[model samples]
Target chain A: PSVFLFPPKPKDTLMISRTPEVTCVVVDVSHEDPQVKFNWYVDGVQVHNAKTKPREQQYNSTYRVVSVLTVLHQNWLDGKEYKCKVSNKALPAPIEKTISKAKGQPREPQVYTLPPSREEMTKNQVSLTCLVKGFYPSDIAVEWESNGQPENNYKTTPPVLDSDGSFFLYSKLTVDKSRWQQGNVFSCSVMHEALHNHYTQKSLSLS
Target chain B: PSVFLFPPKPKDTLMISRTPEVTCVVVDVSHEDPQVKFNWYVDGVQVHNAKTKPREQQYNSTYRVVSVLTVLHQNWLDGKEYKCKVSNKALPAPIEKTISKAKGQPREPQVYTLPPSREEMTKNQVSLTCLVKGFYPSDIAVEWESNGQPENNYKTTPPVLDSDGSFFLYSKLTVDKSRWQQGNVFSCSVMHEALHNHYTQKSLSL
Candidate 1:
């Protein structure tokens, strides 16, 4: 028999106020002579509200059974653990799967600022690039500034997946040659969930 | 962060001679500053061969990460517990999900036989219906016998899902009306994993 548990782990935002349910599917049973049984439990106690759907036969002559258990948002936030138990005469013992809220720290991101090359600066326009890489929880904000003032003429690329399960992105600020020669400080600032402070800034200047 | 474990429980057939792997995915992360770390363990012992894939950024500005762990089929049959642990700076603690082989008993099926109705017997041919219900592990076989001899003129329906997570099915045997009038016994026999004996049989006679 194959048994699968849904919502293998709770989402981080599950801490938020929202009601969700979990499901368990037991499948690939070639024997059901004695009738299969499914039971749900939370925190070692039986859950009476769980609903077990009827068994379904698959094309391969095997059977599939489903059981759903709904949990209160508060109960989930409280770190309650849920378990699904399936029993049948053909199995040596009862099969069980357990799930609960996830607990883990978040990863931070690295930021770098690149000044326009000499050849690029020789052109009519030069662009300063801010590279943000290796960040988790892809939600992030990137902003550009000229001489400490917010600059609106900047474009940021969408976040890209990194090699280590993180993300990277680029933000470019274009300026005229005259402005580049003036040696105005250009900075790229990033706001990320991993950061404890307001934002992290990287700066570039020709001087 | 949202983390999901694949193969939430070991399959019963894993006890058979076959190798399989497990996966863990961590998603919906908005922060990966220090880089997300994933680790695998079996029975409290860390696995050194686990592979962690790079993080992927979703269109929704969230991140998804994947990790996979392979195990020996024998070790799995031995009931080793596996765990996937994900950690990052933004989380208060490391997130973990564990999986292991499933251990459960199988359910048995019930079998019943219905003799052909008198109205049907009035015709040149009559049929007997065999009903099999309330069984787990859908693997079952139904056979028919007439007067202690195997009968080939029978059809069995595909297994149907039952309300309680079990299955039901039907098999019908057709025979000549003269055979029914002769008072010959017809039997439907079932073979199931739940049954210790060879098979269970239900018979009907006039």
Candidate 2:
């Protein structure tokens, strides 16, 4: 007998943050079959397509059978929700689902939340980091703009892969007090591929 | 009684690259002695006239007194000695000194020297980080250029600023191994306010 499924249900859940750059998921398709292919997703979207083999590549992370999604959410005109879904289609039937972007569920994110409050940093000061602690292998971008053309800087920071199959990334942006004091919106955004979700948090400070 | 004296030993040698931005040395004669006047110049051309009151308040970094003579050396082709001279008759006589294109005492800058050699890195592989240890105040920019234009394939880690103020930067440039065959130049450039000296010390690797 053979089984065709992804993260063989009731056995595939891990928690991660929705606001930080990286997220972790245990897409454990450990079932009774050895030839079965495993897969992962977010909000019904099949990220990176289905794979015949397990996750061994790290685009935004390290996973044996997990998808590390880059935070590819469109710029937030306003805050919104992001979801993740994983599946495997084979002999029995294509098994898939639309899981909540929150904690407590197998393969579910630690929480589907907004970015932390924006901070007001002083001139020539180090930026304080606020991390979103529960999503996975995908959120990778944060948009730092306040209405002027948001294309001054490029994405440069390297994403990190941890020992327990998780992802981590940190980025620092500097704003001249002149621009910030005039009422600019400084943002912290994260795009997670696993959650198919992106979260943005905003705030301010002065000299 | 009035007398003429050689410019007080030129302190704080000013290095000029492609850009010549600053024009005035507007200081507050209101606070400083009205008797004290400033004589400014570019390559000893006698540029700005003497002024008692400085006009605007801007961010300026005052470097320690450096002799201009130390900055100049024989020109690459003509062997002509080029030195920067300044005269402030009111203070401690006058000063002048030679300057070098290589700037201050040119010994290979081990502190923030060129980056290490490059090797091919592939996808799924641990990202490679180049630690070009030894920089200060963290005012440096890193560029990854393939061919002649800037590229996006590489990732630069946020530099670590130690209490000592030296710069520590890392980069994980590629996730595609197929792209490693072509050589690339990832440079670390230090920016100083007075002169944006970009005398690049590159590491040619693939």
Candidate 3:
């Protein structure tokens, strides 16, 4: 039959906080039958072509069909589910898959450090950067400690993403040439995951 | 005796191909000196912008200062580096930090599989999903085999982040009811960072 319809990439899962407009497309299907049939639905309610028509094209000698559905982000926020049902003579009855939200717990962080900058060397300042990567549940806090007291003067970057879908974060701590030169230590601590016991720190040293 | 100017996040790293403008801000200092000085340089050349003067604000019974710099993406494409230097009586000398580029190598991939979907049971269709996660360097591929033969009809998502800086990816394949009704097996293989011997697979059943 040469009908190689690889399953589509599942739609992106958005954490619905505000109104969101999302699209669902079924792609990479090739059928010898010119009129391959496609049906769409949202939570068991059939979607009418009058609402939005399915897009079709021919690529690599096959009939590729794409159907898109856009819904108010509020619907998902309210815990609604959407599904796309595909039926054709190429094979079995109806192929159906559901689309929902992406929600999960905060992942454990992969922590590391970056080398001190050149100017920090010239000024004799013991500047240190603590980088924390690949954490979810974006709301996070960072703490700095120096010389037996809580330090709040450091800057933490808002969680950002690497191209591969993980978050990157870090904070910098600058120490006076005199204080650190006297063998004083510095620490950077991170807290997340709804855990009071889930705190970790990276300390700076003379070497 | 407390001058708390934690350094700031450096500018993002780009892989040579780029666009758009970006601003890197160096911030959060409680230097007691009211006349704290700020210096900016790009590739060793000093820059002064009257449009955006450094701002100082006080909070929590202390003085806090912030300095911001705007640069075109192309400035980095030419291999230039920027530095933000701060001077204050509270500091022994000018404390400076550099904002350059991000560069690295790709890490190994962790692979697995998701349970068969419900529709695969009712329709008697052999639908399987192979998942690959926690890889680095983004450039990776997945190969699928069905019913004793290599199958190329599968789609894999571009690597996405796992909130902890690892790539997540997966591919899916569907087989006919008749071919798999006789108990056929499906296999998925991944290639990345030159690991050809690394492999894993799951068999499909009626």
User: Which stretches in model 2 have alpha-carbon errors above 4 Å?
Assistant: A1-207, B1-128, B147-149, B152-159, B182-198, B204-206
Model 2: fraction of native contacts: 0.13
In candidate 3, stretches whose alpha carbon ends up further than 4 angstroms from where it belongs are A1-22, A47-50, A103-207, B1-206
lDDT of 2 by residue, A1-207 (tens): 222222211111211332222222433343432233334454444555433223432223312244333333221111222233333332356444333322322121222112111222343322322232223443345545545556243233454543324444444444554555655455554444344433444443332
Better of 1 and 2 by lDDT: 1
Give the candidate order by descending DockQ: 2, 3, 1
Highest lDDT: give the candidate number.
1
Model 2 TM-score relative to the real fold: 0.25
Quote the positional error of residue B38 for candidate 1 in Å: 33
TM-score of 1: 0.28
- Model 1 CA deviation exceeding 4 Å by range: A8-19, A31-34, A47-57, A105-207, B1-206
User: What is the CA-based DockQ of model 1?
Assistant: 0.01
Look at candidate 1 and tell me the lDDT of residue B95.
Answer: 84
For residue B131, model 1's alpha carbon misses the true position, in angstroms, by 62
Candidate 1, backbone clash total: 66
Q: List model 3 lDDT by residue over A103-176, tens digit each.
A: 55456655444335333456644445566655654545677887688865455555665432545455656567
